[PDB]
Amino acid sequence: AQSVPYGVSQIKAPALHSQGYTGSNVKVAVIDSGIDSSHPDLKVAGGASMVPSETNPFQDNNSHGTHVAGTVAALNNSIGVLGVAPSASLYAVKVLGADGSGQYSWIINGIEWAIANNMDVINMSLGGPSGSAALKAAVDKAVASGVVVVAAAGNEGTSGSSSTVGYPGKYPSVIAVGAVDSSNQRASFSSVGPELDVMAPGVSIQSTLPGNKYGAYNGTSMASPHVAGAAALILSKHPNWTNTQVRSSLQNTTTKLGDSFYYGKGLINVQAAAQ
Amino acid sequence: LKTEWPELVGKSVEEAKKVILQDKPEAQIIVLPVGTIVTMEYRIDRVRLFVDKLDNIAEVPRVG
Ligand SMILES: [Ca+2]
Ligand SMILES: [Ca+2]
Numbered sequence: 001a002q003s004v005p006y007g008v009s010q011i012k013a014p015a016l017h018s019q020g021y022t023g024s025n026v027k028v029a030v031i032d033s034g035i036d037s038s039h040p041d042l043k044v045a046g047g048a049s050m051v052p053s054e055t056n057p058f059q060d061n062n063s064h065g066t067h068v069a070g071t072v073a074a075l076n077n078s079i080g081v082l083g084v085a086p087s088a089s090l091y092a093v094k095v096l097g098a099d100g101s102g103q104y105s106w107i108i109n110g111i112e113w114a115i116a117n118n119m120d121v122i123n124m125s126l127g128g129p130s131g132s133a134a135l136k137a138a139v140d141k142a143v144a145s146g147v148v149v150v151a152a153a154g155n156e157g158t159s160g161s162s163s164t165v166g167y168p169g170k171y172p173s174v175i176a177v178g179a180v181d182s183s184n185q186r187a188s189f190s191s192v193g194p195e196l197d198v199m200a201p202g203v204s205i206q207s208t209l210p211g212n213k214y215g216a217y218n219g220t221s222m223a224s225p226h227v228a229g230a231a232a233l234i235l236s237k238h239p240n241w242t243n244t245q246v247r248s249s250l251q252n253t254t255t256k257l258g259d260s261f262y263y264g265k266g267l268i269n270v271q272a273a274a275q
Numbered sequence: 276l277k278t279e280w281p282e283l284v285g286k287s288v289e290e291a292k293k294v295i296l297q298d299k300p301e302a303q304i305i306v307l308p309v310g311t312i313v314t315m316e317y318r319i320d321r322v323r324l325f326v327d328k329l330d331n332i333a334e335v336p337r338v339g
Contacts (some may be wrong), residue, residue, distance in 0.1 A: 032314070033314065062314070064314040064316055067316075095312075096312070096313075096314065099305065099307060100305075100307075100313050100314040101307045101308065101311040101312065101313050102311060102312050102313075103308075103310075103311060103312075104310070104311075104312060106312075107312050125314065125315050125316075126312050126313060126314055126315055127312065127313070127315050128310075128311065128312045128313070129334070130310075152315035154315060155315055155317045155339050166315075167312075187317075189317045189339065217316045218316065218317045219314075219315050219316035219317040220315045220317075221314055221315035221316045221317075222316065224315070
């Protein structure tokens, strides 16, 4: 049988599926470690690899990318899980090697590809502790071009008075996503700061794993794809909305969870946002 | 509950591994190049070590 991960229902995606909005014809680029396109519960539309030594983007030697992809768009059938936007056009942009790391330039390159290939939404379940003029420029460029850019806020917890949001989550052009649990409490590892935008389920997230498996991961990595997926659903309902309109709807219709320093605007509500 | 090792920056990889394993015996160590972007999944027993061209710790090792 098929299982609906809690995160999926927590953000109210199912209410949309039932109205017939499943993210059809929305192009979402998962900028990560690749995606196991052979997974029975995934349908990869295409992709490109930016890792010099690893040319097949459809080969996930890390597993992270496959997991994230599953949250975005695991297929609606009678097996595995169900993604937030199961009808979305999934593109695998591999910018990370097997070890889960990538040079800043590989990441930038992926963003460039993303823009040039008309992706609607970009998901970046990755981060670094420092910025770059070039990194900033690529994300700014994506948003100027009409792309919805979402990234993990980071897993640095709290550090006194300081913001612990990583890059590219830190940039204002990006929707930086924090992690809450099934009870809407902030996960202890979830980075905090003025730059945190919204929260999504990031604890015990059941998704797809390479070689026809399923498993649960924790991380702001897991929260991100929920928002990426939601954006896709909104665009499936409102194909004519701008990235700005998408972002706004998501930010203005959240469930307040507490102090913005810790929670940004709160938990996303795709049903409310799609209104 | 030692989750960071400030003392190790500048130390060699081999040296670093010994201190860590001493503090957190169950640690799963991974060596990566400094100045890289990484995945944002949180693993409670993992310790990422970012090294320079010299194989010396370039950033404060911390759990996650
Ligand atoms: Ca399924
Ligand atoms: Ca931000």
